PDB file of C-alpha atoms in Angstrom:
ATOM      1  CA  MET A   1       0.107   0.226  -0.224  1.00 23.50           C
ATOM      2  CA  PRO A   2       1.167   3.452  -0.953  1.00 22.81           C
ATOM      3  CA  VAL A   3       0.740   4.755   2.649  1.00 23.29           C
ATOM      4  CA  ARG A   4       0.005   3.436   6.327  1.00 23.06           C
ATOM      5  CA  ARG A   5      -3.977   4.355   6.073  1.00 21.06           C
ATOM      6  CA  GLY A   6      -6.687   2.251   6.019  1.00 19.42           C
ATOM      7  CA  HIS A   7      -4.527  -1.290   7.224  1.00 20.02           C
ATOM      8  CA  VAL A   8      -2.849  -1.187  10.412  1.00 22.05           C
ATOM      9  CA  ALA A   9       0.590  -3.457  11.257  1.00 23.45           C
ATOM     10  CA  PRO A  10       0.102  -5.938  14.614  1.00 22.63           C
ATOM     11  CA  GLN A  11       0.412  -3.462  16.917  1.00 17.93           C
ATOM     12  CA  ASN A  12       2.201  -5.704  19.316  1.00 20.08           C
ATOM     13  CA  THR A  13       5.159  -6.385  17.341  1.00 21.14           C
ATOM     14  CA  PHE A  14       4.970  -3.139  15.815  1.00 25.07           C
ATOM     15  CA  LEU A  15       5.472  -1.176  19.397  1.00 25.05           C
ATOM     16  CA  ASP A  16       8.275  -4.307  20.159  1.00 24.20           C
ATOM     17  CA  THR A  17      10.214  -2.636  17.545  1.00 24.27           C
ATOM     18  CA  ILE A  18       9.897   1.163  19.142  1.00 22.49           C
ATOM     19  CA  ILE A  19      10.751  -0.240  22.195  1.00 21.76           C
ATOM     20  CA  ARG A  20      14.106  -1.582  20.651  1.00 20.77           C
ATOM     21  CA  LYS A  21      14.500   1.831  19.503  1.00 19.41           C
ATOM     22  CA  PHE A  22      14.015   3.732  22.991  1.00 15.91           C
ATOM     23  CA  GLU A  23      15.180   0.855  24.944  1.00 16.78           C
ATOM     24  CA  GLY A  24      18.831   1.876  26.205  1.00 14.08           C
ATOM     25  CA  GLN A  25      20.232  -0.910  27.085  1.00 14.05           C
ATOM     26  CA  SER A  26      22.010  -2.287  24.284  1.00 14.22           C
ATOM     27  CA  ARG A  27      20.884   0.470  21.806  1.00 16.04           C
ATOM     28  CA  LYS A  28      21.856   4.064  21.811  1.00 14.95           C
ATOM     29  CA  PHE A  29      19.977   7.379  20.394  1.00 14.24           C
ATOM     30  CA  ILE A  30      19.525  11.116  20.802  1.00 13.41           C
ATOM     31  CA  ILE A  31      16.997  13.460  20.456  1.00 10.10           C
ATOM     32  CA  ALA A  32      16.755  16.950  18.450  1.00 10.28           C
ATOM     33  CA  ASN A  33      14.762  19.254  16.654  1.00  6.10           C
ATOM     34  CA  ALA A  34      14.062  18.603  12.906  1.00  8.28           C
ATOM     35  CA  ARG A  35      11.834  21.972  12.673  1.00  8.58           C
ATOM     36  CA  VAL A  36      14.917  24.021  13.493  1.00  7.22           C
ATOM     37  CA  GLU A  37      17.839  25.428  10.990  1.00  4.38           C
ATOM     38  CA  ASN A  38      20.483  24.446  13.805  1.00  2.00           C
ATOM     39  CA  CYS A  39      18.718  20.764  14.073  1.00  2.00           C
ATOM     40  CA  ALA A  40      19.922  20.572  17.649  1.00  2.42           C
ATOM     41  CA  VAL A  41      19.996  17.946  20.734  1.00  4.60           C
ATOM     42  CA  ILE A  42      17.488  18.919  22.839  1.00  4.35           C
ATOM     43  CA  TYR A  43      18.076  15.554  24.875  1.00  5.48           C
ATOM     44  CA  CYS A  44      20.227  12.283  24.736  1.00  6.08           C
ATOM     45  CA  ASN A  45      20.242   8.661  26.331  1.00  7.91           C
ATOM     46  CA  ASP A  46      22.453   7.031  28.614  1.00 10.66           C
ATOM     47  CA  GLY A  47      23.125   4.951  25.182  1.00  9.74           C
ATOM     48  CA  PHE A  48      24.774   7.542  23.526  1.00 10.01           C
ATOM     49  CA  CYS A  49      27.138   8.469  26.876  1.00 11.42           C
ATOM     50  CA  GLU A  50      28.366   4.422  26.397  1.00 11.41           C
ATOM     51  CA  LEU A  51      28.320   4.802  22.486  1.00 11.72           C
ATOM     52  CA  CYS A  52      30.528   7.535  22.546  1.00 15.40           C
ATOM     53  CA  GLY A  53      32.289   7.545  26.669  1.00 19.14           C
ATOM     54  CA  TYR A  54      31.372  11.048  26.630  1.00 17.59           C
ATOM     55  CA  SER A  55      28.761  12.984  28.478  1.00 20.00           C
ATOM     56  CA  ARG A  56      24.823  14.414  28.474  1.00 20.81           C
ATOM     57  CA  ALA A  57      26.573  18.155  28.982  1.00 21.54           C
ATOM     58  CA  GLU A  58      29.296  17.384  25.774  1.00 21.48           C
ATOM     59  CA  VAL A  59      25.827  17.124  23.408  1.00 24.20           C
ATOM     60  CA  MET A  60      23.556  19.316  25.038  1.00 22.59           C
ATOM     61  CA  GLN A  61      22.181  21.418  22.336  1.00 24.55           C
ATOM     62  CA  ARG A  62      25.029  20.454  20.009  1.00 21.67           C
ATOM     63  CA  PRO A  63      23.693  20.063  16.215  1.00 23.33           C
ATOM     64  CA  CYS A  64      22.580  16.290  15.241  1.00 22.51           C
ATOM     65  CA  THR A  65      25.124  16.227  12.051  1.00 21.05           C
ATOM     66  CA  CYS A  66      27.365  13.576  13.113  1.00 20.36           C
ATOM     67  CA  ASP A  67      30.507  15.030  11.441  1.00 20.68           C
ATOM     68  CA  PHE A  68      30.996  16.982  14.682  1.00 19.57           C
ATOM     69  CA  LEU A  69      32.189  13.982  16.399  1.00 21.27           C
ATOM     70  CA  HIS A  70      33.620  12.109  12.940  1.00 23.07           C
ATOM     71  CA  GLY A  71      36.866   9.988  13.947  1.00 21.40           C
ATOM     72  CA  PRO A  72      39.341   8.697  11.711  1.00 22.10           C
ATOM     73  CA  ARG A  73      38.048   5.616  10.362  1.00 19.55           C
ATOM     74  CA  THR A  74      34.757   8.294   9.313  1.00 19.57           C
ATOM     75  CA  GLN A  75      33.666   8.073   5.718  1.00 21.22           C
ATOM     76  CA  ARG A  76      33.319  11.971   4.516  1.00 18.88           C
ATOM     77  CA  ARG A  77      30.773  10.862   2.203  1.00 19.52           C
ATOM     78  CA  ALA A  78      28.830   9.391   5.055  1.00 21.17           C
ATOM     79  CA  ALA A  79      29.411  12.689   7.120  1.00 19.97           C
ATOM     80  CA  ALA A  80      28.449  14.533   4.131  1.00 19.78           C
ATOM     81  CA  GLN A  81      25.084  12.582   3.173  1.00 19.46           C
ATOM     82  CA  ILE A  82      24.004  13.435   7.197  1.00 18.77           C
ATOM     83  CA  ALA A  83      24.698  17.240   6.778  1.00 18.77           C
ATOM     84  CA  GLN A  84      22.257  17.291   3.957  1.00 15.89           C
ATOM     85  CA  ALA A  85      19.707  15.108   5.491  1.00 15.73           C
ATOM     86  CA  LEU A  86      19.863  17.457   8.243  1.00 18.78           C
ATOM     87  CA  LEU A  87      19.939  20.417   5.995  1.00 17.57           C
ATOM     88  CA  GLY A  88      16.709  19.141   4.555  1.00 18.13           C
ATOM     89  CA  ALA A  89      17.480  17.040   1.107  1.00 16.10           C
ATOM     90  CA  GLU A  90      16.121  14.372   2.013  1.00 20.00           C
ATOM     91  CA  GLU A  91      15.101  12.153   5.467  1.00 20.52           C
ATOM     92  CA  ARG A  92      17.143   9.354   5.146  1.00 18.68           C
ATOM     93  CA  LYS A  93      19.506   6.883   6.542  1.00 19.20           C
ATOM     94  CA  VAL A  94      23.124   6.828   6.232  1.00 16.94           C
ATOM     95  CA  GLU A  95      26.259   4.464   7.943  1.00 15.70           C
ATOM     96  CA  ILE A  96      28.837   6.398   9.791  1.00 13.79           C
ATOM     97  CA  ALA A  97      31.895   5.667  12.290  1.00 15.96           C
ATOM     98  CA  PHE A  98      32.051   6.672  15.669  1.00 17.01           C
ATOM     99  CA  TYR A  99      35.139   7.100  17.951  1.00 16.68           C
ATOM    100  CA  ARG A 100      35.885   6.502  21.575  1.00 15.48           C
ATOM    101  CA  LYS A 101      37.158   8.642  24.485  1.00 15.58           C
ATOM    102  CA  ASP A 102      39.300   5.969  25.351  1.00 13.55           C
ATOM    103  CA  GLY A 103      40.526   6.811  21.717  1.00 16.13           C
ATOM    104  CA  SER A 104      39.263   3.626  19.209  1.00 14.36           C
ATOM    105  CA  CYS A 105      37.260   4.535  16.082  1.00 14.77           C
ATOM    106  CA  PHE A 106      34.842   2.193  14.556  1.00 11.31           C
ATOM    107  CA  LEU A 107      32.233   1.613  11.139  1.00 13.81           C
ATOM    108  CA  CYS A 108      29.509  -0.434  11.908  1.00 13.49           C
ATOM    109  CA  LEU A 109      25.787  -0.794  10.763  1.00 12.00           C
ATOM    110  CA  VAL A 110      24.249   2.427  11.977  1.00 12.02           C
ATOM    111  CA  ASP A 111      20.806   2.892  11.895  1.00 11.84           C
ATOM    112  CA  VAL A 112      20.127   6.979  11.643  1.00 12.74           C
ATOM    113  CA  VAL A 113      16.564   7.368  11.055  1.00 10.96           C
ATOM    114  CA  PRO A 114      14.381   9.996  12.499  1.00  7.32           C
ATOM    115  CA  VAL A 115      10.766  10.657  13.832  1.00 12.13           C
ATOM    116  CA  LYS A 116       7.688  11.586  11.606  1.00 17.35           C
ATOM    117  CA  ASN A 117       4.180  11.855  12.269  1.00 19.78           C
ATOM    118  CA  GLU A 118       0.901  10.298  10.810  1.00 20.65           C
ATOM    119  CA  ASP A 119       1.152  12.557   7.536  1.00 18.54           C
ATOM    120  CA  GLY A 120       4.801  11.703   7.291  1.00 19.64           C
ATOM    121  CA  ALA A 121       6.547  14.780   8.025  1.00 21.76           C
ATOM    122  CA  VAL A 122       9.928  14.501  10.305  1.00 22.36           C
ATOM    123  CA  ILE A 123       8.611  16.594  13.533  1.00 20.30           C
ATOM    124  CA  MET A 124      11.670  15.249  15.396  1.00 17.22           C
ATOM    125  CA  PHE A 125      15.463  14.025  14.641  1.00 18.67           C
ATOM    126  CA  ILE A 126      15.619  10.642  16.821  1.00 20.84           C
ATOM    127  CA  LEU A 127      18.989   9.700  15.643  1.00 20.50           C
ATOM    128  CA  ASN A 128      19.390   6.133  16.871  1.00 22.83           C
ATOM    129  CA  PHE A 129      22.642   6.013  16.824  1.00 21.23           C
ATOM    130  CA  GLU A 130      22.578   1.802  16.977  1.00 19.94           C
ATOM    131  CA  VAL A 131      26.010  -0.032  16.733  1.00 17.82           C
ATOM    132  CA  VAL A 132      25.062  -3.112  14.838  1.00 15.84           C
ATOM    133  CA  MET A 133      27.081  -6.115  13.039  1.00 13.68           C
ATOM    134  CA  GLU A 134      26.645  -9.469  11.836  1.00 14.96           C
ATOM    135  CA  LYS A 135      27.093 -12.546  13.400  1.00 16.97           C
TER     136      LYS A 135
END
């Protein structure tokens, strides 16, 4: 179907997916205003704190643009596409590498996808920086 109208998904597992999105124990994420030109981090999870090894006071009201925290393994194409997605070219998922406060830098299959309303417009930038890899 072209849009999520008339039909409804199985709400229990559809919600379970959103639970894993905000689960904050093995998954990691931030909260940003998608409606502002500065795309700033109005709130942040303890998951991001364990991801980067920083502190919430270090992300408070910074731009959500992952370029501002790029490391020696982060691809410029990845950081650029994100900068364009927050600039408003397209709301799109991209991969990116992060670096820890301990001095280690890594690329994983990160899930950089924001949150939208029943119209499909992105009202918040919850760019879940969930590091994931295959077994």
